[PDB]
Amino acid sequence: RVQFTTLEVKSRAQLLSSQSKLLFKTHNLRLSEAYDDIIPRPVDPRKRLDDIVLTVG
């Protein structure tokens, strides 16, 4: 399993794997979709806050 950073990298890697052009160690790779979500992180540079003050009450 592998998780890319954005959606365009996945859409490019699937188009590269659809033409059977991804050859690694004399073994073809057929990239397919599988809902696993090994890291529960939203893939968006605007929805990933890194520093925000939080209070409760």
């Binding site: 659809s18 033409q19 059977s20 050859l23 004399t26 073994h27 073809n28 057929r30």
Partner: protein, 142 residues
């Protein structure tokens, strides 16, 4: 003439490699006649990729209505035989098996020498094939 003709598309390869000094089980299926191919062919001398178009024929003779049999082992050129294809094989049929559950479950077992080929589909198309028959495998990639 031609007993069965179709245009397939390569679905998946069983070794899925290159220069493996073996034979690849190229699985293919039709789109206009609902067939299924399981022909073994090596990728080293005849390169095939996942996703292509190729026609396949199956004739009991290659004399083009000039002789009803094959003849000797080494056939010389005589009276413009059928050489329009690119991949010509030879083999003998040995097993006709059926299956239940679905309508298109009639398979076809043939052996072109040491290789194998499965042709699963409806019984209406492969009804012209007898038992212990000497067939051919005309193929051309386009």
């Amino acid at each position: 003439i031609i007993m069965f003709e179709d245009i397939f598309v390569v679905d998946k390869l069983d070794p899925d490699g290159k220069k493996f000094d073996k034979v690849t089980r190229v699985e293919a299926r039709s789109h206009n006649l609902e067939m299924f191919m399981h022909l073994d062919v090596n990728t080293e001398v005849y390169p095939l990729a996942v996703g292509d178009k190729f026609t396949l024929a199956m004739a009991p003779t290659l004399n083009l209505d000039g002789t009803p049999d094959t003849g000797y082992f080494t056939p010389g050129a005589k009276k413009t035989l059928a050489d329009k294809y690119e991949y010509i094989m030879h083999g003998k049929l040995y097993k006709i098996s059926e299956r239940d559950g679905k309508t298109p479950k009639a398979e076809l077992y043939v052996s072109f020498g040491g290789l194998l080929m499965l042709l699963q589909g409806d019984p209406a198309h492969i009804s012209h094939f007898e038992l212990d028959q000497r067939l051919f495998l005309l193929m051309r990639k386009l």
